[PDB]
Design a protein around this nucleic acid. Structure first.
Ligand SMILES: [Mg+2]
Ligand SMILES: [Mg+2]
Ligand SMILES: [Mg+2]
Ligand SMILES: [Mg+2]
Ligand SMILES: [Mg+2]
Ligand SMILES: [Mg+2]
Ligand SMILES: [Mg+2]
Ligand SMILES: [Mg+2]
Ligand SMILES: [Mg+2]
Ligand SMILES: [Mg+2]
Ligand SMILES: [Mg+2]
Ligand SMILES: [Mg+2]
Ligand SMILES: [Mg+2]
Ligand SMILES: [Mg+2]
Ligand SMILES: [Mg+2]
Ligand SMILES: [Mg+2]
Ligand SMILES: [Mg+2]
Ligand SMILES: [Mg+2]
Ligand SMILES: [Mg+2]
Ligand SMILES: [Mg+2]
Ligand SMILES: [Mg+2]
Ligand SMILES: [Mg+2]
Ligand SMILES: [Mg+2]
Ligand SMILES: [Mg+2]
Ligand SMILES: [Mg+2]
Ligand SMILES: [Mg+2]
Ligand SMILES: [Mg+2]
Ligand SMILES: [Mg+2]
Ligand SMILES: [Mg+2]
Ligand SMILES: [Mg+2]
Ligand SMILES: [Mg+2]
Ligand SMILES: [Mg+2]
Ligand SMILES: [Mg+2]
Ligand SMILES: [Mg+2]
Ligand SMILES: [Mg+2]
Ligand SMILES: [Mg+2]
Ligand SMILES: [Mg+2]
Ligand SMILES: [Mg+2]
Ligand SMILES: [Mg+2]
Ligand SMILES: [Mg+2]
Ligand SMILES: [Mg+2]
Ligand SMILES: [Mg+2]
Ligand SMILES: [Mg+2]
Ligand SMILES: [Mg+2]
Ligand SMILES: [Mg+2]
Ligand SMILES: [Mg+2]
Ligand SMILES: [Mg+2]
Ligand SMILES: [Mg+2]
Ligand SMILES: [Zn+2]
Lengths: 138, 237, 208, 151
RNA sequence: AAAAAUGCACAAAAA
RNA sequence: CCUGGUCCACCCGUGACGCUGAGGCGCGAAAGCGUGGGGAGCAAACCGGAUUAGAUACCCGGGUAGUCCACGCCCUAAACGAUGCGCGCUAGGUCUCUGGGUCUCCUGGGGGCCGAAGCUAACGCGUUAAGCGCGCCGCCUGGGGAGUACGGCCGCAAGGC
RNA sequence: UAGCGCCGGCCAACUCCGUGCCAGCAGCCGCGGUAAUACGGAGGGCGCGAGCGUUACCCGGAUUCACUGGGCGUAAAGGGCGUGUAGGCGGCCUGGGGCGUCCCAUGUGAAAGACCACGGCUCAACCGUGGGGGAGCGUGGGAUACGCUCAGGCUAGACG
């Protein structure tokens, strides 16, 4: 059914990382690519490759992490600590340029769709636009 | 020399536990035949390398490896092979705290010292006909547990475990202390709480002899000199 | 108005010489030498661990006690020194220090800040040529403050001035001693003037 | 070199046929105001002992506190059980704005200027434990890049 | 698978 | 005999035709109610015998509504998994019901235990989530007063909302 | 001219006496039953000072109506269960339009007040002069990712 295909994906990933899977597929779309585009480019993923499972288009996404650690619980750090949906089907979040966030004083990224395409807080603030805020990551 | 081939290996030493598997252990299992998970020996040697190298590095740089296992399979093979490198070991009932409480547990070693001081030496006859046997009895049980532990009045830089499940405590004790954990890992347990990993049958005394034998050699060859093979086939079925 | 009456009982309560008096606080009394403990019956008792609020309370009380100023006036300045383009502690101090009554004591026209106040308020001071009566006047850089001509004789001042030779005023200040006048060059720093006060505490006190 | 501060001392009680028998917890902070702090919770039959192991346990549990100019890299929030601390960084000239428990910890390591709010359970033991894990996860652009590189 | 009802208001301290 | 839901295999058809759902409507244990019937055993109420200080109870002997059927009402409940519905995502182990398969094994839809990660105040939950997420509905906002009063709607009444 | 409130914890300030569950205090927890830092006087301290207290009311602390920023197994909280009206939400591909959204341009957003400077009353309070700006809404030009709508295709949802 999938009311929110984007938020499903973001969650697909959040769930993927926290078990330290190498790779996980999400149902493919023009929009999810454009987002996932920004996600490798900013370093949060190694990246993706369009694939097909049972004839059906997917995006196989290759997860990234930290180094094995020392002390008990050796399990690494996380590249994506936190990723959460913002503008949602239930409530749509539309910020003018001046109203754009800075995630973790800039250490994090805020992805947001605008009429100049899928951009970032930095990226959008420079073209000078604003639009539908998709999510935030760090 | 140092390394080892698959010829002697491939007979008894590949795969052990059927379906009792910890799932983390995927990477080191190749296929399942006979309902038993079979270990992939290629990736064993892949690791047996990275590991051995850390041992050899630790040996020729002069630091200690603590040997532990309680199972009836690795109980004998550990006592021998550890003294063979003159190393500390536990073949008997790994005690709680033996690392995190070290300065405390070891005060039982010092007691072992004082108990050795009276064997044929004087002041032993001065004790009552009863208290004799009593004090000596405390030595005999002291002897049992602290034999291997006696060496190395300081805590190691590594420990070597047969079944990282069978002694979880041990691993966790070390792991809490930032003490590198090397162990011979089975399907029985999981990777990743082990630092340097040796992925093969934890049971099957045959398999234990092979790995631990030439594991001690690799240390000898590193520190100085070499030796002949260590006693193995004495009982061995 | 401003606190009247026993002043060395403050020197004592706070546990530091505030020098609220004249020279006597530089002699072997201040009250402080004889009895370096808090006033009243219980002062010689073993103290108890002071409360976090207690600690901030006194620090504020000290600082205020020093410039001998009402809690009303004092709070103004602190709120004034809040926003504050500034580091806010310093700003507060600069302002406190800019008080005509404070400056006059700083310029040694008078020995005690309490003596400074009566000096300003009896007509015995001038700012930039003008008679100024009000201890709360804020002086700014370049201001010339001087004994008014109407009484330049005034045994008290001459005594305070002729003995002011042998002294060097604070950096932010300068004094021409044969002319009975002096100048406010700038705003004193945290560094520029060391006070017994931890200014970081007075702020935490008005955090309430 | 190191500086100790106790934020809490509790008398607790167990019941025996006799009556109440007590025991003492002591919460202690440890830090050099250079960006090292630690926290440990001592319990023993009398106050000083329990303040002793409090200091002891403190030093055996520590944290990297990436100050810059007496403040923190980014805005963080953590929850430990039902207690929650929000840590927001401030320009210089601000001060540490905190309640007694997180103030003590933030002071003994750097942090001349910070913003905090306690939310949720204000129970000081669990708020302390929530603050440590909050510093613990602080990260800088350094950690950030060295985290996203590749290879 | 049990014979048997009830009990005066308020009340330390072990920093 | 009539009849609902449901699952599996084949991958044939439609082409988003979906989710949820304030109101509405319908169903709704027991007891209760109306009109008939039916009444063996049970058994509120009631009588008697024991017990007890008392015994309007507990045990014993009786015993009428009721329990049963038809039609028509009542609408409640510890009506409970005290856990709204749909969807996607997140280790395994083991028992069992019922399909399909190259019937050791694999696969699908149910029913139980133990458990990864995570969650949780704890107890615990955990691919039958109480985890990670989205949609939409219902509900909470200290205890008592009180699910009472008033009003309104519904019921033959009890009474219900 | 100096007064007023407080000194058990919260909360800054402690001792003697009197009283003896009395007289009394009390914002909350609670003090008083014959040694009371908690009542009343005292000495002594803390706070503020031409004021200090009290009562009443508003906001805050209260993420305690939670948009920011909460919840519903056992703490208050899942409707007894369905079926479904309106409403809310809505899979994959491509175009049109540009309603939402976004950008620039512009009119308006009175003065006072507030914020920032500088000045005028001996300071200040007051008061003057200048600067800084939104948001929203009108108009004009544009952008089209997303939501919308309109058209056309799909099979992964859903039905057969
Ligand atoms: Mg034992
Ligand atoms: Mg005259
Ligand atoms: Mg919570
Ligand atoms: Mg509280
Ligand atoms: Mg009675
Ligand atoms: Mg009683
Ligand atoms: Mg009483
Ligand atoms: Mg049928
Ligand atoms: Mg078909
Ligand atoms: Mg077709
Ligand atoms: Mg019914
Ligand atoms: Mg019935
Ligand atoms: Mg009746
Ligand atoms: Mg009937
Ligand atoms: Mg009848
Ligand atoms: Mg009958
Ligand atoms: Mg009877
Ligand atoms: Mg009777
Ligand atoms: Mg009967
Ligand atoms: Mg009968
Ligand atoms: Mg109902
Ligand atoms: Mg209910
Ligand atoms: Mg199942
Ligand atoms: Mg766990
Ligand atoms: Mg009420
Ligand atoms: Mg009712
Ligand atoms: Mg009514
Ligand atoms: Mg109801
Ligand atoms: Mg007061
Ligand atoms: Mg006090
Ligand atoms: Mg008396
Ligand atoms: Mg008395
Ligand atoms: Mg008494
Ligand atoms: Mg008193
Ligand atoms: Mg009082
Ligand atoms: Mg009194
Ligand atoms: Mg509020
Ligand atoms: Mg909300
Ligand atoms: Mg709540
Ligand atoms: Mg409940
Ligand atoms: Mg229900
Ligand atoms: Mg509809
Ligand atoms: Mg759509
Ligand atoms: Mg438009
Ligand atoms: Mg105006
Ligand atoms: Mg002026
Ligand atoms: Mg103006
Ligand atoms: Mg269409
Ligand atoms: Zn003095």
């Amino acid at each position: 059914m999938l009311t929110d295909p984007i938020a499903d994906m973001l969650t697909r990933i959040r769930n993927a990382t926290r078990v330290y899977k190498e790779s996980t597929d999400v149902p493919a779309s023009r929009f999810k690519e454009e987002i996932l585009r920004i996600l490798a480019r900013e370093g949060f993923i190694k990246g993706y490759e369009r694939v097909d499972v049972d004839g059906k288009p997917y995006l196989r996404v290759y997860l990234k992490y930290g180094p094995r650690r020392q002390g008990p619980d050796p399990r690494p750090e996380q590249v994506i600590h936190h990723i959460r949906r913002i503008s949602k089907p239930g409530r749509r979040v539309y910020v003018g340029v001046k109203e754009i966030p800075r995630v973790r004083r800039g250490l994090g990224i805020a992805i947001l769709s605008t009429s100049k395409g899928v951009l970032t807080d930095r990226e959008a603030r420079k073209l000078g636009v604003g639009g539908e805020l998709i999510c935030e990551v760090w | 020399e140092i390394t080892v081939k698959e010829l002697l290996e491939a007979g008894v030493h590949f795969g052990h536990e059927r379906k009792r598997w910890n799932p983390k252990f995927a990477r080191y299992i190749y296929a399942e035949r006979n309902g038993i998970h079979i270990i992939d020996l290629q990736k064993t040697m892949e690791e047996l390398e990275r590991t051995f190298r850390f041992i050899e590095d630790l040996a020729m740089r002069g630091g200690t490896i603590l040997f532990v296992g309680t199972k009836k399979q690795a109980q004998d093979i550990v006592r021998m092979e550890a003294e063979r490198a003159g190393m500390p070991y536990v073949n008997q009932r790994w005690l709680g705290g033996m690392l995190t409480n070290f300065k405390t547990i070891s005060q039982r070693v010092h007691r072992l010292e004082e108990l050795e001081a009276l064997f044929a030496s004087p002041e032993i006859e001065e004790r009552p006909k009863k208290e004799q046997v009593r004090l000596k009895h405390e030595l005999e049980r002291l002897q049992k547990y602290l034999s291997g532990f006696r060496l190395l009045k300081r805590l190691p830089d590594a420990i070597f475990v047969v079944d990282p499940t069978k002694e979880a405590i041990a691993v966790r004790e070390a792991r809490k202390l930032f003490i590198p954990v090397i162990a011979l890992a089975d399907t029985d347990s999981d990777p990743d709480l082990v630092d340097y990993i040796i992925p093969g049958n934890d049971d099957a005394i045959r398999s234990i002899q092979l790995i631990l034998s030439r594991a001690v050699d690799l240390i000898i060859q590193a520190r100085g000199g070499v030796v002949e093979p260590s006693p193995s086939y004495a009982l061995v079925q | 108005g401003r606190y009247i009456g026993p002043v060395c009982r403050l020197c004592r309560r706070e546990g530091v010489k505030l020098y609220l008096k004249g020279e006597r606080c530089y002699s072997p009394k201040c009250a402080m030498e004889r009895r370096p403990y808090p006033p009243g019956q219980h002062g010689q008792k073993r103290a108890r661990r002071p409360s976090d609020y207690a600690v901030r309370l006194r620090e504020k009380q000290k600082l205020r006690r020093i410039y001998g100023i009402s809690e009303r006036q004092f709070r103004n300045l602190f709120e004034e020194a809040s926003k504050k383009k500034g580091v806010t502690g310093s700003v507060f101090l600069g302002l406190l220090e800019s008080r005509l009554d404070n400056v006059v004591y700083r310029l040694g026209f008078a020995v005690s800040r309490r003596q400074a106040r009566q000096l300003v308020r009896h007509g015995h001071i001038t700012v930039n040529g003008r008679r100024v009566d009000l201890p709360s006047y804020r002086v700014r850089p370049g201001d010339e403050i001087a004994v008014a001509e109407k009484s330049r004789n005034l045994e008290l001042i001459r005594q305070n001035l002729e003995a002011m030779k042998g002294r060097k005023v604070g950096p932010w200040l300068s004094l021409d001693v044969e002319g009975m006048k002096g100048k406010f060059l700038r705003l004193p720093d945290r560094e520029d003037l060391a006070l017994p006060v931890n200014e970081q505490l007075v702020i935490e006190f008005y955090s309430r | 070199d190191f500086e100790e501060k106790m934020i809490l001392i509790r008398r607790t009680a167990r019941m025996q046929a006799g009556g109440r028998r007590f025991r003492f917890g002591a919460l202690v902070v440890v830090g050099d105001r250079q960006g090292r702090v630690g926290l440990g919770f001592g319990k023993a039959p009398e106050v000083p002992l329990a303040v002793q192991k409090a200091g002891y346990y403190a030093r055996r549990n520590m944290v990297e506190v990436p100050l810059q100019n007496g403040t923190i890299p980014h805005e963080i929030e953590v929850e430990f059980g039902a207690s929650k601390i929000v840590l927001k960084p401030a320009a210089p000239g601000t001060g540490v704005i905190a309640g007694a428990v997180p103030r003590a910890i933030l002071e003994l390591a750097g942090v001349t200027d910070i913003l905090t709010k306690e939310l949720g359970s204000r129970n000081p033991i669990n708020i302390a434990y929530a603050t440590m894990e909050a510093l613990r996860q602080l990260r800088t652009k350094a950690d950030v890049e060295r985290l996203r590189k590749g290879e």
